[PDB]
DNA sequence: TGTGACTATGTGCGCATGCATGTGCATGTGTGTGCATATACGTGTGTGCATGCATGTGCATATATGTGTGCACGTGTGTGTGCATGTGTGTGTATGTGTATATATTAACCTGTGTGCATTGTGTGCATATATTAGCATGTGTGCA
DNA sequence: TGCACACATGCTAATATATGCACACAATGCACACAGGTTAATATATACACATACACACACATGCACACACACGTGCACACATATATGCACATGCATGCACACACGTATATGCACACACATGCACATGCATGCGCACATAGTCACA
């Protein structure tokens, strides 16, 4: 859990994601912008997943809750049920 | 035959917030389109919520969760209050 | 029988609770519908309608108009951040767009 | 000593990571980030192991697809270096 | 009905660009825009006609267009749906 | 004779057409285009008058939104005139390809 | 308890197209997700088609129209041919 | 009575016709489900499964692999124009991306 | 850099139009009423499993160094695009008409539901052995000076 | 052309993951029996397509030149590639709480059927806000002093 875990998404990790996206050169300001984008994306998905969990009267977020939340946002994911 | 719409109810709401303001027929059609659209989104999400939890009935709890899923931040909070207040008032008078 | 009271009046709502209940029943959403589900849904629909109509009425008043037209609905929705998100993939007929010119295109 | 020209190792890394399928973010730091974000919605939440895995799979897929769109915006401006304005334009066009 | 795409005239395309905030237009935009509109119309009309067949009708109604637009994520208000 | 400098009346048109809501494509040529396209799907097809109006409303809204995205791509490339590659980029990012 | 999936049916399909090719558990899960996703898309479209036409029954005609709306051009043509052939054989045999 | 045979064998299908009927009936799609609807739906699901599996098996063979993995499913879908359109908004876990480098980034 | 001329958008002012609004028939639908039925819920249960801890290697991360080269800035030039003019033609509006057709009514009948029973296929839990993964020398294969 | 670096390749052990198997059981199929949704035939009103007419505003083509885009060149610092120390993620186990799921009894609540009013939609005027156009003020543009 902890605090300030967005720094755990390191610059080499962001670089690897950019390489998979076919990016050759990366400006130094990309890493801070990428962390903000990821946090916004995760906040939207996790908020909906917890809402599904709360409706089920559960305390554990399941893979199905994440899958339903992703489907709710038009980002359906295969391979987790 | 009779074509049901929400026009007469939208007009009643309009007189509550703007007693001296009218509405055009084309604008009324858009408001009718908006109500049907939001109805289908909430009812569809509530229907899936009952199916995910192996429930066969849609209750106010399913509607409340669907409203939170579909509505943005402040809209969801205020809509939940109106829905809860109406339900509380409804059961107080049977 | 006693005097027939509409469920909308019982819940203090202008939107039809009975019609919403029937639409839920015949809409193929679930085999059963709770008593409070149409009341909750009708209240939410009434609240959202009031939010748009209040904003659109202000837009109509700004343009010195007493009648709401599709343009006023478009101005109300797109100028409200939360309504714009809810209706982000919705086209409003005869609504136009918001006046917006990029600063780079303005003369210097 | 042998030294590769700038962009030669970058091109090799593009071929290397476009060929593999493993997750590119470390699992434990990502799990801590998920729990910290979730604590703002509920207290003392638990996560299934596959729930975090599903989140990481979607997060990395979202970021990789965004970088692909970001790369096109940079090339459109006759550049080869992605910049924050490249990301902002891609997200604006996508509707985010 | 032959070669009606040229009915989308240059002044019509320019007016659409002005509403979009475009200040300057290249001469190659007009042919590119016509191809874009042609592709968009085919997708909506094909679905709208498909709805017409299922109803066993020969008249494309406004609801058929509305349902076709909704299916593509392009919900339109003000035409009965 | 008086002559406005280039781009001066273009900005006037932007303000004019962003204030109004009327359809910008002529109705009759658009109706002919709709019927021509529907021929490849059926023969002897009739259209409701509101069906063609719904198609025109969606078509113009789609094109105007595309031009807004196209304009941002041109400005991103430090230009003020939209080009076909600007449209192609916007559709590619949008996923309309 | 018992969890229901399409894994056994996907495996039989695999053994016809590729008799000597196996599938991983992760790939089988993706195939199960794909079948459920396509099922929900088609059934949802067919359900809306019946409601639009004031019908209470989902028939093969609704399924066929839903296939044409959801699948891309050449995929839809072959899918329609497969569905029509199965219904004809099913009716001819019973 | 007679020896019971499944409707899948009657329709000449491998996907479960009887289970699709139950999923349609209990899925809250309509009040009634016709006899031909599950047969048609099962055949379409079987055909789409066969189309992806035969393309994924080709990708596995191209990689000298005898077992289909998520990478082969992703390669099959993204290299097929129609299947990419059908699954355009779908993320396949552990599928990766297509090898694609813009020519401007290639060495001069 | 202020200043006159030119143009175009905006602001009342006056006036007709058609379109929104209020007023009744009436009918279909929501309501009140018991009634029976089944879903959901509270209670308890046992078990998986997620959390936290402790240990270990070694892989990846962070830091610093040098430098190539891409970004950005400025320059200039051609031409493509905007602006404006004159002309006609195709659009918009109104008018009318015949025709195809979408709609509604009515009878009936076929198909889907419902119910219960027989039972076969399906999923679970285990063996089993295959393909996959991990090394180590070789074998190109590209980059780079 | 030769050197150094990285990815690949035939190669052997090892294992963990997939494959196949046996068993109960829950869901599928089979057989009625019922009933209502759907079809079909008819009639009817609708509104769409077709033609006709007019006037005129818009589209088309032209001529003119402005300034925007594109190429070019310059320099600089930003970012890549590299090396080195090191933090820490990964794997591995071990223990325990604890939450999740099953199972069950059962009351609460929802559907069902029916009578019956009344709320809602269609149709009917009606008047009033919007549109239309004239004149006039007024912000803005673009040479020019």
């Amino acid at each position: 859990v902890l605090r300030d875990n967005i720094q755990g998404i390191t610059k080499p990790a962001i670089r690897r994601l950019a390489r998979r996206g076919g990016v050759k050169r990366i400006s130094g300001l990309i890493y801070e912008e990428t962390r903000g984008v990821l946090k916004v994306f995760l906040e939207n998905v996790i908020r909906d997943a917890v809402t599904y969990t709360e409706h089920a009267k559960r305390k554990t977020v399941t893979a199905m809750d994440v899958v339903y939340a992703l489907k709710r946002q038009g980002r359906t994911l295969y391979g987790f049920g | 035959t009779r074509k049901e719409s929400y026009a007469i109810y939208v007009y009643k709401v309009l007189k509550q917030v703007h007693p001296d303001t009218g509405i055009s027929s084309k604008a009324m059609s858009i408001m009718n389109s908006f109500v049907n659209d939001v109805f289908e989104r909430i009812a569809g999400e509530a229907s899936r919520l009952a199916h995910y939890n192996k429930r066969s009935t849609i209750t106010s709890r399913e509607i409340q969760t669907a409203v939170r899923l579909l509505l943005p931040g402040e809209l969801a909070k205020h809509a939940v209050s109106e829905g809860t207040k109406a339900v509380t008032k409804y059961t107080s008078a049977k | 029988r006693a005097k027939a009271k509409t469920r909308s009046s019982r819940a203090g709502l202008q939107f039809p609770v009975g019609r919403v209940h029937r639409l839920l029943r015949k809409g193929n959403y679930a085999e059963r519908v709770g008593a409070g589900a149409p009341v909750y849904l009708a209240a939410v629909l009434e609240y959202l309608t009031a939010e748009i109509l209040e904003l659109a009425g202000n837009a109509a008043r700004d343009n010195k108009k007493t009648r709401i037209i599709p343009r006023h609905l478009q101005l109300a929705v797109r100028n409200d951040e939360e309504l714009n998100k809810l209706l982000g993939r919705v086209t409003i007929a005869q609504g136009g767009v918001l006046p917006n010119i990029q600063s780079v295109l303005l003369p210097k | 000593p042998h030294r590769y020209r700038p962009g030669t190792v970058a091109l090799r890394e593009i071929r290397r990571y476009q060929k593999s399928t493993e997750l590119l973010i470390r699992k434990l730091p990502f799990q801590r980030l998920v729990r910290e974000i979730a604590q703002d919605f509920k207290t003392d939440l638990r996560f299934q192991s596959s729930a975090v895995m599903a989140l990481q799979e979607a997060s990395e897929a979202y970021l990789v697809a965004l970088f692909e769109d970001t790369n096109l915006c940079a090339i459109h401006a006759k550049r080869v270096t992605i910049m924050p304005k490249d990301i902002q334009l891609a997200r604006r066009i996508r509707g985010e």
PDB file of all heavy atoms in Angstrom, chain I residues 99-109:
ATOM      1  P    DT I  99     -52.532   5.903 -60.146  1.00  0.00           P
ATOM      2  OP1  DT I  99     -52.373   5.187 -61.431  1.00  0.00           O
ATOM      3  OP2  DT I  99     -53.835   5.884 -59.446  1.00  0.00           O
ATOM      4  O5'  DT I  99     -51.423   5.375 -59.126  1.00  0.00           O
ATOM      5  C5'  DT I  99     -50.058   5.704 -59.337  1.00  0.00           C
ATOM      6  C4'  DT I  99     -49.221   5.304 -58.140  1.00  0.00           C
ATOM      7  O4'  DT I  99     -49.471   6.212 -57.042  1.00  0.00           O
ATOM      8  C3'  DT I  99     -49.501   3.897 -57.606  1.00  0.00           C
ATOM      9  O3'  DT I  99     -48.320   3.120 -57.661  1.00  0.00           O
ATOM     10  C2'  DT I  99     -49.970   4.124 -56.161  1.00  0.00           C
ATOM     11  C1'  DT I  99     -49.401   5.494 -55.841  1.00  0.00           C
ATOM     12  N1   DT I  99     -50.175   6.231 -54.803  1.00  0.00           N
ATOM     13  C2   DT I  99     -49.538   6.658 -53.662  1.00  0.00           C
ATOM     14  O2   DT I  99     -48.354   6.469 -53.447  1.00  0.00           O
ATOM     15  N3   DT I  99     -50.339   7.323 -52.774  1.00  0.00           N
ATOM     16  C4   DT I  99     -51.686   7.596 -52.908  1.00  0.00           C
ATOM     17  O4   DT I  99     -52.322   8.202 -52.052  1.00  0.00           O
ATOM     18  C5   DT I  99     -52.294   7.118 -54.125  1.00  0.00           C
ATOM     19  C7   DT I  99     -53.752   7.356 -54.382  1.00  0.00           C
ATOM     20  C6   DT I  99     -51.519   6.466 -55.003  1.00  0.00           C
ATOM     21  P    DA I 100     -48.390   1.520 -57.535  1.00  0.00           P
ATOM     22  OP1  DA I 100     -47.776   0.947 -58.753  1.00  0.00           O
ATOM     23  OP2  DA I 100     -49.770   1.139 -57.161  1.00  0.00           O
ATOM     24  O5'  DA I 100     -47.436   1.209 -56.295  1.00  0.00           O
ATOM     25  C5'  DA I 100     -46.151   1.809 -56.237  1.00  0.00           C
ATOM     26  C4'  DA I 100     -45.756   2.110 -54.804  1.00  0.00           C
ATOM     27  O4'  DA I 100     -46.761   2.951 -54.182  1.00  0.00           O
ATOM     28  C3'  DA I 100     -45.609   0.885 -53.904  1.00  0.00           C
ATOM     29  O3'  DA I 100     -44.455   1.030 -53.098  1.00  0.00           O
ATOM     30  C2'  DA I 100     -46.888   0.908 -53.068  1.00  0.00           C
ATOM     31  C1'  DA I 100     -47.130   2.401 -52.938  1.00  0.00           C
ATOM     32  N9   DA I 100     -48.522   2.752 -52.673  1.00  0.00           N
ATOM     33  C8   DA I 100     -49.622   2.343 -53.370  1.00  0.00           C
ATOM     34  N7   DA I 100     -50.751   2.827 -52.911  1.00  0.00           N
ATOM     35  C5   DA I 100     -50.363   3.608 -51.836  1.00  0.00           C
ATOM     36  C6   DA I 100     -51.089   4.393 -50.922  1.00  0.00           C
ATOM     37  N6   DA I 100     -52.418   4.520 -50.956  1.00  0.00           N
ATOM     38  N1   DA I 100     -50.396   5.045 -49.969  1.00  0.00           N
ATOM     39  C2   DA I 100     -49.066   4.916 -49.938  1.00  0.00           C
ATOM     40  N3   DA I 100     -48.274   4.211 -50.742  1.00  0.00           N
ATOM     41  C4   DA I 100     -48.992   3.573 -51.677  1.00  0.00           C
ATOM     42  P    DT I 101     -43.939  -0.187 -52.191  1.00  0.00           P
ATOM     43  OP1  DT I 101     -42.464  -0.096 -52.143  1.00  0.00           O
ATOM     44  OP2  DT I 101     -44.591  -1.426 -52.667  1.00  0.00           O
ATOM     45  O5'  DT I 101     -44.519   0.152 -50.743  1.00  0.00           O
ATOM     46  C5'  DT I 101     -44.340   1.449 -50.202  1.00  0.00           C
ATOM     47  C4'  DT I 101     -44.964   1.550 -48.825  1.00  0.00           C
ATOM     48  O4'  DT I 101     -46.348   1.987 -48.939  1.00  0.00           O
ATOM     49  C3'  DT I 101     -45.007   0.238 -48.040  1.00  0.00           C
ATOM     50  O3'  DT I 101     -44.779   0.504 -46.670  1.00  0.00           O
ATOM     51  C2'  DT I 101     -46.443  -0.217 -48.264  1.00  0.00           C
ATOM     52  C1'  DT I 101     -47.145   1.121 -48.171  1.00  0.00           C
ATOM     53  N1   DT I 101     -48.537   1.122 -48.698  1.00  0.00           N
ATOM     54  C2   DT I 101     -49.484   1.899 -48.075  1.00  0.00           C
ATOM     55  O2   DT I 101     -49.242   2.605 -47.114  1.00  0.00           O
ATOM     56  N3   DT I 101     -50.734   1.826 -48.623  1.00  0.00           N
ATOM     57  C4   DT I 101     -51.126   1.066 -49.706  1.00  0.00           C
ATOM     58  O4   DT I 101     -52.277   1.068 -50.126  1.00  0.00           O
ATOM     59  C5   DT I 101     -50.086   0.267 -50.309  1.00  0.00           C
ATOM     60  C7   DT I 101     -50.393  -0.599 -51.493  1.00  0.00           C
ATOM     61  C6   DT I 101     -48.855   0.331 -49.780  1.00  0.00           C
ATOM     62  P    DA I 102     -43.459  -0.037 -45.936  1.00  0.00           P
ATOM     63  OP1  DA I 102     -42.292   0.509 -46.653  1.00  0.00           O
ATOM     64  OP2  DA I 102     -43.597  -1.498 -45.761  1.00  0.00           O
ATOM     65  O5'  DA I 102     -43.545   0.638 -44.493  1.00  0.00           O
ATOM     66  C5'  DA I 102     -43.846   2.022 -44.380  1.00  0.00           C
ATOM     67  C4'  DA I 102     -44.976   2.255 -43.391  1.00  0.00           C
ATOM     68  O4'  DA I 102     -46.253   2.060 -44.049  1.00  0.00           O
ATOM     69  C3'  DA I 102     -44.971   1.338 -42.171  1.00  0.00           C
ATOM     70  O3'  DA I 102     -45.223   2.101 -40.998  1.00  0.00           O
ATOM     71  C2'  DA I 102     -46.096   0.343 -42.463  1.00  0.00           C
ATOM     72  C1'  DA I 102     -47.054   1.171 -43.303  1.00  0.00           C
ATOM     73  N9   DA I 102     -47.833   0.371 -44.244  1.00  0.00           N
ATOM     74  C8   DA I 102     -47.366  -0.611 -45.066  1.00  0.00           C
ATOM     75  N7   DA I 102     -48.290  -1.159 -45.816  1.00  0.00           N
ATOM     76  C5   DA I 102     -49.444  -0.487 -45.463  1.00  0.00           C
ATOM     77  C6   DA I 102     -50.774  -0.600 -45.901  1.00  0.00           C
ATOM     78  N6   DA I 102     -51.169  -1.472 -46.831  1.00  0.00           N
ATOM     79  N1   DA I 102     -51.686   0.220 -45.343  1.00  0.00           N
ATOM     80  C2   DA I 102     -51.283   1.092 -44.413  1.00  0.00           C
ATOM     81  N3   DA I 102     -50.062   1.292 -43.922  1.00  0.00           N
ATOM     82  C4   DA I 102     -49.181   0.462 -44.495  1.00  0.00           C
ATOM     83  P    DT I 103     -45.427   1.378 -39.578  1.00  0.00           P
ATOM     84  OP1  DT I 103     -44.967   2.326 -38.540  1.00  0.00           O
ATOM     85  OP2  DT I 103     -44.841   0.021 -39.637  1.00  0.00           O
ATOM     86  O5'  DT I 103     -47.012   1.239 -39.461  1.00  0.00           O
ATOM     87  C5'  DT I 103     -47.836   2.363 -39.739  1.00  0.00           C
ATOM     88  C4'  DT I 103     -49.282   2.065 -39.401  1.00  0.00           C
ATOM     89  O4'  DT I 103     -49.918   1.394 -40.519  1.00  0.00           O
ATOM     90  C3'  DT I 103     -49.482   1.160 -38.185  1.00  0.00           C
ATOM     91  O3'  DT I 103     -50.461   1.720 -37.328  1.00  0.00           O
ATOM     92  C2'  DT I 103     -49.950  -0.163 -38.793  1.00  0.00           C
ATOM     93  C1'  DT I 103     -50.676   0.314 -40.038  1.00  0.00           C
ATOM     94  N1   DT I 103     -50.766  -0.716 -41.109  1.00  0.00           N
ATOM     95  C2   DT I 103     -51.976  -0.952 -41.715  1.00  0.00           C
ATOM     96  O2   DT I 103     -52.996  -0.357 -41.421  1.00  0.00           O
ATOM     97  N3   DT I 103     -51.951  -1.914 -42.687  1.00  0.00           N
ATOM     98  C4   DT I 103     -50.862  -2.649 -43.104  1.00  0.00           C
ATOM     99  O4   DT I 103     -50.942  -3.494 -43.989  1.00  0.00           O
ATOM    100  C5   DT I 103     -49.622  -2.355 -42.429  1.00  0.00           C
ATOM    101  C7   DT I 103     -48.369  -3.092 -42.798  1.00  0.00           C
ATOM    102  C6   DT I 103     -49.633  -1.413 -41.475  1.00  0.00           C
ATOM    103  P    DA I 104     -50.610   1.203 -35.815  1.00  0.00           P
ATOM    104  OP1  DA I 104     -50.577   2.394 -34.940  1.00  0.00           O
ATOM    105  OP2  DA I 104     -49.638   0.108 -35.597  1.00  0.00           O
ATOM    106  O5'  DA I 104     -52.076   0.570 -35.782  1.00  0.00           O
ATOM    107  C5'  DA I 104     -53.170   1.306 -36.306  1.00  0.00           C
ATOM    108  C4'  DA I 104     -54.330   0.387 -36.637  1.00  0.00           C
ATOM    109  O4'  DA I 104     -54.041  -0.350 -37.852  1.00  0.00           O
ATOM    110  C3'  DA I 104     -54.651  -0.659 -35.565  1.00  0.00           C
ATOM    111  O3'  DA I 104     -56.040  -0.642 -35.280  1.00  0.00           O
ATOM    112  C2'  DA I 104     -54.222  -1.980 -36.206  1.00  0.00           C
ATOM    113  C1'  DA I 104     -54.420  -1.692 -37.683  1.00  0.00           C
ATOM    114  N9   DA I 104     -53.594  -2.520 -38.554  1.00  0.00           N
ATOM    115  C8   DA I 104     -52.236  -2.663 -38.510  1.00  0.00           C
ATOM    116  N7   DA I 104     -51.760  -3.476 -39.420  1.00  0.00           N
ATOM    117  C5   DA I 104     -52.883  -3.896 -40.110  1.00  0.00           C
ATOM    118  C6   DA I 104     -53.054  -4.771 -41.199  1.00  0.00           C
ATOM    119  N6   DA I 104     -52.042  -5.400 -41.803  1.00  0.00           N
ATOM    120  N1   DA I 104     -54.310  -4.973 -41.647  1.00  0.00           N
ATOM    121  C2   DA I 104     -55.320  -4.341 -41.039  1.00  0.00           C
ATOM    122  N3   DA I 104     -55.283  -3.497 -40.010  1.00  0.00           N
ATOM    123  C4   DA I 104     -54.023  -3.317 -39.588  1.00  0.00           C
ATOM    124  P    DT I 105     -56.612  -1.386 -33.976  1.00  0.00           P
ATOM    125  OP1  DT I 105     -57.402  -0.395 -33.213  1.00  0.00           O
ATOM    126  OP2  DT I 105     -55.497  -2.099 -33.315  1.00  0.00           O
ATOM    127  O5'  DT I 105     -57.604  -2.483 -34.580  1.00  0.00           O
ATOM    128  C5'  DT I 105     -58.523  -2.115 -35.598  1.00  0.00           C
ATOM    129  C4'  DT I 105     -59.068  -3.343 -36.302  1.00  0.00           C
ATOM    130  O4'  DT I 105     -58.074  -3.865 -37.217  1.00  0.00           O
ATOM    131  C3'  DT I 105     -59.452  -4.501 -35.377  1.00  0.00           C
ATOM    132  O3'  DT I 105     -60.801  -4.876 -35.610  1.00  0.00           O
ATOM    133  C2'  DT I 105     -58.476  -5.623 -35.752  1.00  0.00           C
ATOM    134  C1'  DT I 105     -58.120  -5.268 -37.185  1.00  0.00           C
ATOM    135  N1   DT I 105     -56.793  -5.792 -37.623  1.00  0.00           N
ATOM    136  C2   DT I 105     -56.727  -6.615 -38.722  1.00  0.00           C
ATOM    137  O2   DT I 105     -57.704  -6.950 -39.365  1.00  0.00           O
ATOM    138  N3   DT I 105     -55.467  -7.035 -39.046  1.00  0.00           N
ATOM    139  C4   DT I 105     -54.290  -6.723 -38.396  1.00  0.00           C
ATOM    140  O4   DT I 105     -53.204  -7.153 -38.766  1.00  0.00           O
ATOM    141  C5   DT I 105     -54.428  -5.856 -37.252  1.00  0.00           C
ATOM    142  C7   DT I 105     -53.217  -5.449 -36.466  1.00  0.00           C
ATOM    143  C6   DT I 105     -55.658  -5.437 -36.924  1.00  0.00           C
ATOM    144  P    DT I 106     -61.587  -5.774 -34.535  1.00  0.00           P
ATOM    145  OP1  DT I 106     -63.002  -5.341 -34.542  1.00  0.00           O
ATOM    146  OP2  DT I 106     -60.814  -5.743 -33.273  1.00  0.00           O
ATOM    147  O5'  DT I 106     -61.494  -7.251 -35.136  1.00  0.00           O
ATOM    148  C5'  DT I 106     -61.937  -7.501 -36.462  1.00  0.00           C
ATOM    149  C4'  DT I 106     -61.509  -8.881 -36.924  1.00  0.00           C
ATOM    150  O4'  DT I 106     -60.112  -8.857 -37.308  1.00  0.00           O
ATOM    151  C3'  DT I 106     -61.648  -9.985 -35.872  1.00  0.00           C
ATOM    152  O3'  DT I 106     -62.419 -11.057 -36.395  1.00  0.00           O
ATOM    153  C2'  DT I 106     -60.203 -10.413 -35.586  1.00  0.00           C
ATOM    154  C1'  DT I 106     -59.502 -10.049 -36.883  1.00  0.00           C
ATOM    155  N1   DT I 106     -58.041  -9.805 -36.722  1.00  0.00           N
ATOM    156  C2   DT I 106     -57.165 -10.342 -37.634  1.00  0.00           C
ATOM    157  O2   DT I 106     -57.521 -11.014 -38.584  1.00  0.00           O
ATOM    158  N3   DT I 106     -55.848 -10.060 -37.396  1.00  0.00           N
ATOM    159  C4   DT I 106     -55.328  -9.313 -36.358  1.00  0.00           C
ATOM    160  O4   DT I 106     -54.124  -9.117 -36.231  1.00  0.00           O
ATOM    161  C5   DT I 106     -56.300  -8.779 -35.434  1.00  0.00           C
ATOM    162  C7   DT I 106     -55.857  -7.951 -34.266  1.00  0.00           C
ATOM    163  C6   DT I 106     -57.595  -9.049 -35.658  1.00  0.00           C
ATOM    164  P    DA I 107     -63.064 -12.151 -35.410  1.00  0.00           P
ATOM    165  OP1  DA I 107     -64.520 -12.184 -35.669  1.00  0.00           O
ATOM    166  OP2  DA I 107     -62.571 -11.882 -34.041  1.00  0.00           O
ATOM    167  O5'  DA I 107     -62.423 -13.527 -35.909  1.00  0.00           O
ATOM    168  C5'  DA I 107     -62.556 -13.912 -37.271  1.00  0.00           C
ATOM    169  C4'  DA I 107     -61.434 -14.849 -37.682  1.00  0.00           C
ATOM    170  O4'  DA I 107     -60.156 -14.180 -37.515  1.00  0.00           O
ATOM    171  C3'  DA I 107     -61.350 -16.146 -36.877  1.00  0.00           C
ATOM    172  O3'  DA I 107     -61.135 -17.245 -37.751  1.00  0.00           O
ATOM    173  C2'  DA I 107     -60.153 -15.914 -35.954  1.00  0.00           C
ATOM    174  C1'  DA I 107     -59.273 -15.021 -36.812  1.00  0.00           C
ATOM    175  N9   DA I 107     -58.360 -14.185 -36.037  1.00  0.00           N
ATOM    176  C8   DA I 107     -58.673 -13.393 -34.968  1.00  0.00           C
ATOM    177  N7   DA I 107     -57.647 -12.749 -34.465  1.00  0.00           N
ATOM    178  C5   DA I 107     -56.585 -13.147 -35.260  1.00  0.00           C
ATOM    179  C6   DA I 107     -55.216 -12.820 -35.245  1.00  0.00           C
ATOM    180  N6   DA I 107     -54.670 -11.980 -34.363  1.00  0.00           N
ATOM    181  N1   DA I 107     -54.428 -13.392 -36.178  1.00  0.00           N
ATOM    182  C2   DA I 107     -54.979 -14.233 -37.061  1.00  0.00           C
ATOM    183  N3   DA I 107     -56.249 -14.616 -37.173  1.00  0.00           N
ATOM    184  C4   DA I 107     -57.007 -14.031 -36.233  1.00  0.00           C
ATOM    185  P    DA I 108     -61.533 -18.733 -37.293  1.00  0.00           P
ATOM    186  OP1  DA I 108     -62.275 -19.363 -38.407  1.00  0.00           O
ATOM    187  OP2  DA I 108     -62.154 -18.643 -35.953  1.00  0.00           O
ATOM    188  O5'  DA I 108     -60.123 -19.467 -37.129  1.00  0.00           O
ATOM    189  C5'  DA I 108     -59.235 -19.549 -38.235  1.00  0.00           C
ATOM    190  C4'  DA I 108     -57.822 -19.863 -37.773  1.00  0.00           C
ATOM    191  O4'  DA I 108     -57.263 -18.713 -37.080  1.00  0.00           O
ATOM    192  C3'  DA I 108     -57.703 -21.039 -36.798  1.00  0.00           C
ATOM    193  O3'  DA I 108     -56.545 -21.794 -37.104  1.00  0.00           O
ATOM    194  C2'  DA I 108     -57.548 -20.336 -35.454  1.00  0.00           C
ATOM    195  C1'  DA I 108     -56.694 -19.154 -35.872  1.00  0.00           C
ATOM    196  N9   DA I 108     -56.684 -18.055 -34.913  1.00  0.00           N
ATOM    197  C8   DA I 108     -57.734 -17.596 -34.170  1.00  0.00           C
ATOM    198  N7   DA I 108     -57.424 -16.593 -33.382  1.00  0.00           N
ATOM    199  C5   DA I 108     -56.078 -16.384 -33.624  1.00  0.00           C
ATOM    200  C6   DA I 108     -55.152 -15.460 -33.103  1.00  0.00           C
ATOM    201  N6   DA I 108     -55.468 -14.539 -32.187  1.00  0.00           N
ATOM    202  N1   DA I 108     -53.883 -15.522 -33.559  1.00  0.00           N
ATOM    203  C2   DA I 108     -53.572 -16.445 -34.474  1.00  0.00           C
ATOM    204  N3   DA I 108     -54.354 -17.363 -35.038  1.00  0.00           N
ATOM    205  C4   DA I 108     -55.606 -17.277 -34.564  1.00  0.00           C
ATOM    206  P    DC I 109     -56.636 -23.098 -38.036  1.00  0.00           P
ATOM    207  OP1  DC I 109     -57.326 -22.723 -39.291  1.00  0.00           O
ATOM    208  OP2  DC I 109     -57.159 -24.205 -37.208  1.00  0.00           O
ATOM    209  O5'  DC I 109     -55.107 -23.419 -38.367  1.00  0.00           O
ATOM    210  C5'  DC I 109     -54.171 -22.352 -38.483  1.00  0.00           C
ATOM    211  C4'  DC I 109     -52.994 -22.568 -37.549  1.00  0.00           C
ATOM    212  O4'  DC I 109     -52.966 -21.521 -36.538  1.00  0.00           O
ATOM    213  C3'  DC I 109     -53.018 -23.892 -36.777  1.00  0.00           C
ATOM    214  O3'  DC I 109     -51.705 -24.413 -36.685  1.00  0.00           O
ATOM    215  C2'  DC I 109     -53.523 -23.459 -35.407  1.00  0.00           C
ATOM    216  C1'  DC I 109     -52.814 -22.125 -35.279  1.00  0.00           C
ATOM    217  N1   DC I 109     -53.374 -21.232 -34.227  1.00  0.00           N
ATOM    218  C2   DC I 109     -52.579 -20.212 -33.698  1.00  0.00           C
ATOM    219  O2   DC I 109     -51.430 -20.061 -34.128  1.00  0.00           O
ATOM    220  N3   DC I 109     -53.093 -19.411 -32.735  1.00  0.00           N
ATOM    221  C4   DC I 109     -54.336 -19.607 -32.300  1.00  0.00           C
ATOM    222  N4   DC I 109     -54.800 -18.791 -31.348  1.00  0.00           N
ATOM    223  C5   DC I 109     -55.160 -20.648 -32.820  1.00  0.00           C
ATOM    224  C6   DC I 109     -54.641 -21.431 -33.771  1.00  0.00           C
TER     225       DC I 109
END
